[PDB]
Design an enzyme around this catalytic site. Structure first.
Site, PDB file in Angstrom:
ATOM      1  N   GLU A 116      -3.595 -23.632-142.492  1.00 55.52           N
ATOM      2  CA  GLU A 116      -5.045 -22.681-143.153  1.00 55.52           C
ATOM      3  C   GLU A 116      -4.819 -23.356-144.734  1.00 55.52           C
ATOM      4  O   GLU A 116      -5.330 -24.076-145.807  1.00 55.52           O
ATOM      5  CB  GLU A 116      -4.793 -21.356-143.436  1.00 55.52           C
ATOM      6  CG  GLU A 116      -4.869 -20.619-142.474  1.00 55.52           C
ATOM      7  CD  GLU A 116      -5.696 -19.178-142.125  1.00 55.52           C
ATOM      8  OE1 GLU A 116      -4.770 -18.826-143.035  1.00 55.52           O
ATOM      9  OE2 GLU A 116      -6.685 -18.762-141.778  1.00 55.52           O
TER      10      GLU A 116
ATOM     11  N   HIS B 277      -2.340 -19.873-137.339  1.00 47.97           N
ATOM     12  CA  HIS B 277      -3.699 -20.356-136.899  1.00 47.97           C
ATOM     13  C   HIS B 277      -3.859 -21.356-136.355  1.00 47.97           C
ATOM     14  O   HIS B 277      -2.270 -22.386-136.632  1.00 47.97           O
ATOM     15  CB  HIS B 277      -4.772 -20.375-138.113  1.00 47.97           C
ATOM     16  CG  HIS B 277      -4.091 -18.919-139.057  1.00 47.97           C
ATOM     17  ND1 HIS B 277      -5.767 -17.906-138.961  1.00 47.97           N
ATOM     18  CD2 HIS B 277      -3.806 -17.688-139.805  1.00 47.97           C
ATOM     19  CE1 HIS B 277      -4.993 -16.860-139.288  1.00 47.97           C
ATOM     20  NE2 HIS B 277      -4.317 -17.069-139.950  1.00 47.97           N
TER      21      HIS B 277
ATOM     22  N   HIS C 216      -9.056 -12.282-132.343  1.00 48.32           N
ATOM     23  CA  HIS C 216      -9.128 -12.874-133.637  1.00 48.32           C
ATOM     24  C   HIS C 216      -7.837 -14.263-133.826  1.00 48.32           C
ATOM     25  O   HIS C 216      -8.105 -15.769-134.362  1.00 48.32           O
ATOM     26  CB  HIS C 216      -8.662 -12.066-135.200  1.00 48.32           C
ATOM     27  CG  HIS C 216      -9.929 -11.095-135.271  1.00 48.32           C
ATOM     28  ND1 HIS C 216     -11.294 -11.345-134.800  1.00 48.32           N
ATOM     29  CD2 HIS C 216      -9.885  -9.725-135.127  1.00 48.32           C
ATOM     30  CE1 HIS C 216     -12.012 -10.597-135.314  1.00 48.32           C
ATOM     31  NE2 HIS C 216     -11.351  -9.553-135.423  1.00 48.32           N
TER      32      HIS C 216
ATOM     33  N   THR D  78      -5.926 -13.896-144.851  1.00 55.31           N
ATOM     34  CA  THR D  78      -6.623 -14.775-145.279  1.00 55.31           C
ATOM     35  C   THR D  78      -7.745 -14.331-143.907  1.00 55.31           C
ATOM     36  O   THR D  78      -8.120 -15.663-143.548  1.00 55.31           O
ATOM     37  CB  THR D  78      -6.216 -16.687-144.385  1.00 55.31           C
ATOM     38  OG1 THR D  78      -6.139 -16.267-143.210  1.00 55.31           O
ATOM     39  CG2 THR D  78      -4.840 -16.788-145.735  1.00 55.31           C
ATOM     40  N   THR D  79      -7.749 -13.358-143.170  1.00 53.03           N
ATOM     41  CA  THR D  79      -8.531 -12.974-142.846  1.00 53.03           C
ATOM     42  C   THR D  79      -9.275 -11.532-143.244  1.00 53.03           C
ATOM     43  O   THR D  79      -8.556 -10.972-143.456  1.00 53.03           O
ATOM     44  CB  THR D  79      -8.036 -12.195-141.066  1.00 53.03           C
ATOM     45  OG1 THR D  79      -6.708 -11.056-141.279  1.00 53.03           O
ATOM     46  CG2 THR D  79      -7.203 -13.461-140.594  1.00 53.03           C
TER      47      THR D  79
ATOM     48  N   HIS E 246       2.278 -17.429-139.913  1.00 50.99           N
ATOM     49  CA  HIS E 246       2.367 -16.132-140.660  1.00 50.99           C
ATOM     50  C   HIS E 246       2.587 -15.126-140.061  1.00 50.99           C
ATOM     51  O   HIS E 246       2.983 -13.948-139.681  1.00 50.99           O
ATOM     52  CB  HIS E 246       0.705 -15.597-141.274  1.00 50.99           C
ATOM     53  CG  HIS E 246      -0.391 -16.331-141.294  1.00 50.99           C
ATOM     54  ND1 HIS E 246      -1.225 -16.603-141.775  1.00 50.99           N
ATOM     55  CD2 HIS E 246       0.244 -18.264-142.469  1.00 50.99           C
ATOM     56  CE1 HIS E 246      -1.524 -17.939-142.445  1.00 50.99           C
ATOM     57  NE2 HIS E 246      -1.002 -18.967-142.411  1.00 50.99           N
TER      58      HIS E 246
ATOM     59  N   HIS F  72       1.984 -14.235-136.635  1.00 54.32           N
ATOM     60  CA  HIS F  72       0.857 -14.746-135.768  1.00 54.32           C
ATOM     61  C   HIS F  72       0.156 -16.623-135.992  1.00 54.32           C
ATOM     62  O   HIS F  72       1.264 -16.466-137.739  1.00 54.32           O
ATOM     63  CB  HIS F  72      -0.098 -14.016-136.325  1.00 54.32           C
ATOM     64  CG  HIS F  72      -0.959 -14.184-137.233  1.00 54.32           C
ATOM     65  ND1 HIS F  72      -0.467 -12.866-138.237  1.00 54.32           N
ATOM     66  CD2 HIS F  72      -1.715 -15.133-137.541  1.00 54.32           C
ATOM     67  CE1 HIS F  72      -1.442 -13.671-139.372  1.00 54.32           C
ATOM     68  NE2 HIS F  72      -1.515 -14.320-139.318  1.00 54.32           N
TER      69      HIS F  72
END
Ligand SMILES: [Zn+2]
Length: 257
Positions: free
Chosen positions: A103, A93, A61, A195-196, A116, A91
């Site tokens: 995000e 995005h 992911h 957010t996941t 994040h 991690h």
């Protein structure tokens, strides 16, 4: 079965994770004219001197850089927070082109990427327990603004060749997570969610106002990652961001204004 495409993306997450349509979902757009001051807010205390990175892992992911959270080694305090939060992983995005990928957005502006740093409240003993509590998690979000190449960041991107596909991991010791922070720590904060999936509404969001840099050439490297495991047909990790969600009853606060 969840992801970021046409048929498994954010629009569809609600089918398996109904909380996707909850009242405290993240990310959000930060409307700066709507931001409120709050005298309770403090400076952030990022106590990362003894931070101990362990490994970098492709989980299908995104990829995470994992930290030893066995002891109070890298902690986050103060800011909007009560008590002590331990860093467990960070991690990113990113998007399929440089004009998108963050995000959170700021007056609907999108950055190329968003970092994040995920922390959990030590009052709950472990991450899993903290994750189900409204005051359980705290995530520092940092925007990556396309411009100059970022040395520090390169230090992460160089390892991506070793974890191209899902489930691969590589040793990644002695990385200073403070090296990926801006030097001014002004922030926005609001109560939100992961957010996941599972999208748990247990996060105090702290989104830094000042971005860090990344070059266009650097952004390419994120996009070399694979969603698939080795031996499966290739599906590149071109984008992995959730769009802004309804703010609903919530207010974004800013520090120092
Ligand atoms: Zn994230």
């Amino acid at each position: 079965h969840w992801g970021y495409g046409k048929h498994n993306g954010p629009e569809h997450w609600h089918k398996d994770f109904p909380i996707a349509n909850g009242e405290r979902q993240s990310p959000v757009d930060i409307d700066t004219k709507a931001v409120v001051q709050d005298p309770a807010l403090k400076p952030l205390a990022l106590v990362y001197g003894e931070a101990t990175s362990r490994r970098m892992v492709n989980n299908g992911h995104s990829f995470n850089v994992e930290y030893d959270d066995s002891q109070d080694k890298a902690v986050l305090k103060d800011g909007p927070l009560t008590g002590t939060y331990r860093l467990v992983q960070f991690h990113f995005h990113w998007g399929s082109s440089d004009d998108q990928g963050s995000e959170h957005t700021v007056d609907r502006k999108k950055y190329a990427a968003e970092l994040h740093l995920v922390h959990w409240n030590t009052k709950y003993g472990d991450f899993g327990t903290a994750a189900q509590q409204p005051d359980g998690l705290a995530v520092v979000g940092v925007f990556l603004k396309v411009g100059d190449a970022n040395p520090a960041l390169q230090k992460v991107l160089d390892a991506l060749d070793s974890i191209k596909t899902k489930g691969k991991s590589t040793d990644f010791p002695n990385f200073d997570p403070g090296s990926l922070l801006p030097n001014v720590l002004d922030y926005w904060t609001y109560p939100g969610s992961l957010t996941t999936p599972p999208l748990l509404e247990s996060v105090t969001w702290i989104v830094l106002k000042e971005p860090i840099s990344v070059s266009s050439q650097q952004m390419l490297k994120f996009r070399t990652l694979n969603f698939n495991a080795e031996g499966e047909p290739e599906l590149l990790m071109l984008a992995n961001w959730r769009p802004a969600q309804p703010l609903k009853n919530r207010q974004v606060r800013g520090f120092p204004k």
